[model samples]
Target chain A: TAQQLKYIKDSIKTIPDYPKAGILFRDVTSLLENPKAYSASIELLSEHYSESGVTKVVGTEARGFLFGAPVALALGVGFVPVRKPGKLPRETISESYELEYGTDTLEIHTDSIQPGDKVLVVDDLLATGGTIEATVKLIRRLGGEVVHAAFIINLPELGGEARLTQQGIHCYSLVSFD
Target chain B: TAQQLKYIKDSIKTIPDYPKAGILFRDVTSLLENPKAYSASIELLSEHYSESGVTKVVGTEARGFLFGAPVALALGVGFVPVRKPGKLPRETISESYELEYGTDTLEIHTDSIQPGDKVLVVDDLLATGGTIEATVKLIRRLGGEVVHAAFIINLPELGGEARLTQQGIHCYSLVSFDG
Candidate 1:
């Protein structure tokens, strides 16, 4: 496990001020290009949710989909995507969350979750945790209980873990930035 | 197999005039939400590329990311996403392709592929085949061999399969308008 952790940390590409100024972006695409590192990612994530009776693994749009769908496949569960605004065509339930400058909303289909379903949330990075928190809310709104929210990178300086933990969501990460 | 195919066909929702008029969108969100159909979708796509000696599974950004990453995992190969311009923050090579109304460019990291790498490209649907062709070009630019291009749906009426296959790129679709 430690070896895989080291490999994942080493493979990710770090760049400064991406998509905005003063933001150091950790690129996850490089991780996906390494077959060994990518499989280790899914295995570690699946190991956490395999015994928790997770029926679905939900991920946010775009980046989250890159890892979330594969994790769901490893767990042999369903995959649900929480997308941005009108990205979802059918009936949807939306929840808005705060961002650095403003707010953003995430939408999920009304039927994404069945009542009393157990779910595990997956994402590539956990920064400030706004998206995960909003996704957790959407899951609950559809009557699903969040078993765990897992990610590959955790930036503790931004307080994402604290925010989600405050909401009683158990968090797990393959690697973290202290 | 027939049942799984039926389940997938029944699960998708369709939208007309999406992203613009005259485009009937094949929405896959509903299919992903269904457990069996979702698993089956990945399983079927994986089975096609499993024994093809594929070293990498490359997909276009956004929609391709949804299914491409999983297919790579299923085949125990690496996943590479060809993204929109400026989305990938690193040294990149860009290719311009034609869309319905205008031209768009896709980018890939210069180091995403290796020399003689065996590649399989995956997508949700095959539209006009422009994206796939451009993606294949990028893979070639990186010195990779495209073994096959796979998709979940085919709009045969749109002539996507014809465009790709005519160029010697083998095409496979789980369901098609012609089917």
Candidate 2:
């Protein structure tokens, strides 16, 4: 498992000052471009919670879907997409959070999660914790328990994992960047 | 195989006049919410191309990522995400095409494809085939061969499949609907 994690971390490409200044973006595209690395990423995520009784895997739009879908399948559970506003074609409950410049919102289909469902929140990275924080609330609002939140990478310096821990949601990541 | 196909088809939820009038949207969310059906959908796609020498799977954002990611995993191949402009954070090649009102664009990282690679373009549905058509050109521009294009649903009345066939790219769908 450690070997596979090393391969995945090695596969990620670092872009300097991406989308903003002073940010080294740990891009997952290269990892996704390698079949063995990508497959191992999914397996590691699933293995973390194989017996955790996770009934559903909830992932945010785009990157979250990339990792979450296969992890859901590996866990033998359904996948729920937590999308941006107006993306879902059904009734939904929404959660909005603050961004540096303004604010953003995420929505989930009303029937996607049930009261007794045990949910695993997934995404590619855990940074700032705003997105997954809002997602955790939405899952709770719909009566689903957030069993654990998983990520491919974690920025410990960003304080996201600490933020989520404040809310009683445990965070797991394959690799971490200080 | 037919039994799994039927179960997958039955799992899809249809809503009338969504995002437009006089149209029924075959939404894949319901199918995704059912574990068995979602797994079956990806299985069928992989089964169809098991022997097609597919080296890479290209899927457009964001639903494409949903189905395409798992299917790529099923085939044990790398997955390439065809995203909108500015989504990819690398040197890239982009394709722009006409939409009903104006135009839209999709992009792929320049390094995502390679010469002589066999590519399978995937999406949730093939409606007008415009999005995927642009995707095909992007793949070819980089010297990758568009082996085949696949979808979970095909709207024959929308003529997307016909439009693709004209370009010498074969199209396959698990279920079909008529107007």
Candidate 3:
């Protein structure tokens, strides 16, 4: 776990004032670019939930898909995409989550989850916890249990895990801070 | 191989007029929801290029990340994102490609690929080949060799694969149509 943790932290690059001033953006895309480092991240993340009985791995739009799909393959389970409004082309359930600026809505196809299915929600980074929380609501709304939620980066200063732990959700991150 | 091919084709839900008129989109997100079919895709595709000496896998933004990340993980290689302008954090090489109504640019980190590193280019679909061509240019511009350009869907009528092949790039797809 320590080796996997180092691989992630080392591979990640920090960009100062990315989206705004005083906000240090942890670029996980740097990790994705190194084959050896990327492999380690996937293996460790997969092994964490490999025995958790996850039947499906759900990930949020764009960045979430980057890791969620591969982790699902690693676990030999199905993958679900949680997307921005109108991106999904079927019957759906939606959740509204807080954003620094305002609010955003994400949707999941209603039929993607079966009742009582075990699920793991994933993302590239855990920021304000709003994104993963929104995914958990969609999964639970469709009757799937959120066994675990994961991120490659966890910014403790952001209070993401504190927010989720209060909700009885288990959170895991390979590396922390920027 | 045939079974693998058929499973993927069947799982796809073709949506007509998606993003606009006369454009029928082959939604592979349909395949992502089916556990078995999605697994089959990863396994078979992994086997297809597992021994091609690929050091890195390059994927365009968003959907391209889906398969590219997994396949890169499958082959034990690193994956690179060819993103839109201003989205990537470091110095990037940019290329402009046709998008029917307008031209769009894609960029890759200047150091993402090394000189002569073998690479695989991937995406969910190949509509007019413009999106992938831009990626290929970005990869090579940084000195990476693109061994293959792969997609889940190829619209021959849209001339994507044809354009890539004309440029001497080997293009492979799990399924096709839009003829």
Candidate 4:
């Protein structure tokens, strides 16, 4: 595990005050740019969930697709995308979550998740648990069982882990920043 | 090859008049939803480029990431994302292409591609060749050599393949539709 962390952590580039002030952004683009680190990241996640009997991998829009698709392929499971409103064409179920200033919405296709499905939710980063919470709600609402929620980076100081724990989901992250 | 296409083609869901009228949108989301189809896609692309000496796979934002990431992983190469402006945090080079009514721009990190790098561009669908043309421009601007551009679906009547061929790229796709 320690061996895996080295490549993943080293590959991430830290930028100062990105999109705002007094914030240190841990950018995973650099990690994705490195084939070695990218493979290690996926391998670690897949190995952890290999024995969990996960049936589907649900990922949020945009960045989530980057990690989720590969992990789904790694585990040989169907991948479902959760997106913002109007992105999907067919019937969908939408969920809204509170942001720092307002609220944001996420939508998933109504039939994407089936009853008794063992699902694993994936996203690139877990910050405040806002997005993941809404995503979990959509999955559960469809009668699917969320096995676990996985992320590439976890900001423990932001309380995402505890927030998800309160919702009966175990949060797993490959790397963490305090 | 026929066996692979059966699963991939059958997995896609075609929706009528999506985002506009008189348009039949072949949605690949259903393909992504099938484990067999999605794996077949990445494998097909990976196997075709297995001996092509492709050093990097450049995928457009959003949907492109779905297939590109896994293809890169399968080929054991790095994956680079070309996205809309401001999505990338570092210094980037931007390229603009003409759309039907207006224009769209794509950006790439300045340091992402190096000289002599062999790049393969991947996207979910190829329609008008506008986006891929701009993507190819961004890569060439950084002195990278584009080996080939690959996609899951191609609209040949729209002339994307011919247009890209004029730009010195051979367009490769798993499926094609006629008007």
Candidate 5:
């Protein structure tokens, strides 16, 4: 189990100033591009939350869709999305959150999560926790119970994990950065 | 075979002024979100190009990636992406092209497609053909063989298929708009 975690930790590539300057981006594209690494990462995350009563998996838009779909299929549960505003055509519930550079809104179909449904939120990276925190609030507002949050990489210096745990949310990261 | 194509044609929903005002947008998200419909769409496109000697399937960024991967896997070929300018980190070759409202660039990793590889370009919809045209040029520059182009839905009135055909490319669409 420990070795598998190390494999994922080793597979991530850190690129300096990508898409813009002063942003150290954790690139998971390489990991997904590799079959073995991708499978292992999914297995590790899935196994960790296998018994947490996860009834559904929720992934954010774009990057989250990539991993979230497979993980949901693997775990034999439904996969719901938290997308950008106006992306979903159905009646939607939205939440506004702060990004590293600015603010954006995320929405989910009103019927995506049912009342009292246990869900797990997954994303590629956890940084400032603002986005996931808002997501947790959105899930609660829908009457769904967020069992936990899982991420590929966690930037500890930002105190993202601590911030969420303070709100009584259980957060798990496969690899943590100093 | 005819009925299958008709079903594919009838499943697509076209909405006007999507992403921007005055844009007649073809939405495939509903088709993709439904497994049966999504699988059928991919099968129809894959079968149409089955005998075309395609060695690779290339999808454009965002939407293209969604169907491109499954189609490539179903056809037993590798899937390559023609992403936005800076999205791909590898050494890439790029082509600048015009969108409906603006100019944009698409890039593919230089080594993704081998020389003489027969490539199938796939996108959710074919409108002005600018994006697909840029994709075709990128494939050609990489020395790839343009076997055929496939789309889930086609707006024939836009004359995209005609334009592509005029360029000597075989274009395949599972469904065509009534207009």
Candidate 6:
């Protein structure tokens, strides 16, 4: 277990100033590139949510879709995406979140998650705790129980997990920055 | 067959302007939102490419990932993505193409497609054929033969399919727009 954690911790690549200035981007794409590392990340995430009664896996747009689909497949549950506004054409419930640069809204199909369905939220990285917090609010508002949240990398210095845990949400990560 | 085409054609929803001004976005998200319609679209795409000897499915970022993954699953092959520049971490070959307002580049990991691998490019919609054209160039440059291109919606008026076909690329679409 320690080795697996080390594998994930060592596998991530940190790119300085990506998409903008002064942002130390945690690129999990490196972990995705390595088969063993990617498998370990998914295994850890799957184990974290194995007993949480996760009936559905919810992933945010684009990046989230990548890990979410495979995790859902591995767990034998359905994958639902929380996409940007105007992206989902069906009747949707919308939630707003603050991005690093600005604010944006995410929408999920009204029928994507049924009432009382257990859900596991997944993404590549957890940063400011804004996006995942908004996703939790959306799921709860839709009547889905947020069982656990999993990420490939957690920026603990940002205090993301602590904030979520303070709200009684179980947050798990394959790797964390001290 | 005609009814099937009609059903496919009827499923697309066209939004006036999206992602930017002057972009007549043909949104296939409606079709995907419905389980039955999504399954039907994938089935049609798979059937069209079944005899083409396609061993791999390549899709562009975001929307392409949605359709291509399932099509690859249905066709029993692997899926590769043509992502935005810097999105792929590994060694990748890049290709740039013109967009409506600007130009953008897409990259595919060097190891994603093998020499002589038959690839079918799948996306949610075919608009100006820019992205798919760049994808085709990337595949050919890497020695992967692109057998066909598939999409949920096609804007025939834009002549996107005509342009690709003129370059000797076989293009297939589940739905087409007359305007």
Query: How many backbone overlaps does candidate 3 show?
Result: 2
How does candidate 5 score on lDDT?
0.75
Q: How close is each model in CA RMSD to the real structure?
A: 2.7, 1.2, 2.3, 1.5, 4.6, 5.3
Two-way lDDT contest, 1 vs 4, winner: 4
Q: Note the B-chain TM-score for every model.
A: 0.93, 0.97, 0.94, 0.96, 0.90, 0.91
Better of 1 and 4 by TM-score: 4
Model 2 misplaced regions, further than 4 Å: none
lDDT of 3 by residue, A13-58 (tens): 9888886788778888888877778888888889988789889999
List, residue by residue over A1-178, the lDDT tens digit for candidate 2. Answer: 6787899999999998897899788889999999999999999999999999999999999799999888999998999999989778888999999988998899999899989999999999999999999999999999999959999999989989999999989999999887
- Candidate 5 deviates by what RMSD? 4.6
TM-score winner between 2 and 4, please give it: 2
The candidate, 3 or 5, that scores higher on TM-score is 3
Candidate 1 per-residue lDDT, tens place, B64-147, comes to 887788888888887999988877887899999997679999999888887989989999989789999999899898899985
Chain B TM, cand. 3:
0.94
Best by TM-score: 2
Computed on C-alphas against the true complex, the DockQ of each candidate is: 0.59, 0.81, 0.65, 0.82, 0.19, 0.17
Candidates in descending lDDT order: 2, 4, 1, 3, 6, 5
What does the lDDT read for residue A44 in candidate 5? 78
Top candidate when judged by DockQ against the true structure: 4
Clashing pairs in 5: none
- Weakest ten-residue segment in model 4 chain B by summed lDDT: B170-179
Model 6, residue B2: displacement in angstroms?
Answer: 6.8
Segments in model 1 whose C-alpha atoms lie over 4 Å from true places: A16-23, A98-103, B13-24, B98-103
Flag clash pairs in model 3: A35-B77, A35-B78
Question: Candidate 4 lDDT, tens digit per residue, A1-178?
Answer: 6977977988999888986799888889899989999999999888889999999999998889988888998999999999988878878999998976898899999888989999999999999888999999999999999959999999989988999999989889999987
Cα deviation of A115, candidate 3, in Å: 2.6
Model 3 chain A lDDT-worst window of ten? A1-10
